Write a sequence for this structure.
């Protein structure tokens, strides 16, 4: 009955590996686009179906390769994922938000036929690492049509975002670049009490946890994107009544479980 529902009923262990879809990549050259530095699109193959879109920003001095594992992971569970490069390696979080805005518009309007055919441009979300997570929160405030936002070990000088876009923030306990007490947790706490929000804190994790295969980041990011981009209530099970020994903190207003 849910026309956006993709793939078989999920199990926890299936969400810690690549999923039911084959994946192709498309390189968006820097010279071919304005408003962002290009990037890599991960999109499903072996399918005639359409999927939601995710634009994802790396952090300060990083490029799209720093989130390649998660682009491919997400695409393999049924998403079109554009991991950007930034115009400059030194772009701040609000510049990253602007480049996510350009990436979303690029996905909708000028992505190649191969990607457009797999994309439902009505269902878009954002995610990002560190300053890219900051950009994720800013664009969530500016664009109320986004289905979800997943800031990963996010960094921003702005601690206050006004959005109703559902937010799941991943903090890293041992993060020395974007300490959770100064970044992730203030972001979580200052989001509106009426916006569905989750904070998960990875035990023992560093700022670079998001840059390689991470079972917790995989489960929470797939689950949040499924729940909100696809309206796939089958993923509530991983986001609700959570007892996860990989986590050393969890905070929610439990507006996503019913
Ligand atoms: Ca603010």
């Amino acid at each position: 009955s849910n026309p956006y529902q993709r793939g078989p009923n999920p199990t926890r262990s299936a969400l810690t590996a690549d999923g039911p879809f084959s994946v192709a990549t498309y390189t968006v050259s820097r010279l071919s686009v304005s408003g962002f530095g290009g990037g890599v699109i991960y999109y499903p193959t072996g399918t005639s179906l359409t999927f939601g879109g995710i634009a994802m920003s790396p952090g300060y001095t990083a490029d799209a390769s720093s989130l390649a594992w998660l682009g491919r992971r997400l695409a393999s569970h049924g998403f079109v994922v554009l991991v950007i490069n930034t115009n400059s390696r030194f772009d701040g979080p609000d510049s990253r938000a602007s480049q996510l805005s350009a990436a979303l518009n690029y996905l909708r309007t000028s992505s190649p036929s191969a990607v457009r055919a797999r994309l439902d441009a009505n269902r878009l979300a954002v995610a990002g690492h560190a300053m890219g997570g900051g950009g994720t929160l800013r664009i969530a405030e500016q664009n109320p049509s986004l289905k979800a936002a997943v800031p990963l070990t996010p960094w921003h000088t702005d601690k206050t975002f006004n959005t109703s876009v559902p937010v799941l923030i991943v903090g890293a306990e041992a993060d020395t670049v974007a300490p959770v007490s100064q970044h992730a947790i203030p972001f979580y706490q200052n989001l509106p009490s009426t916006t569905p929000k989750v904070y998960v804190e990875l035990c023992n994790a560093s700022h670079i946890a998001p840059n390689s295969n991470n079972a917790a980041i995989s489960v929470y990011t797939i689950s949040w994107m499924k729940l909100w981009v696809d309206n796939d209530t089958r993923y509530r099970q991983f986001l609700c009544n959570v007892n996860d020994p990989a986590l050393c903190d969890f905070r929610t207003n439990n507006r996503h479980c019913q």
The chain has one domain: 1-258. The chain is about 25% helix and 25% strand. The two ends are 18 Å apart (CA to CA). The helical segments are 68-76, 93-109, 113-116, 131-142, 184-190, 215-229.
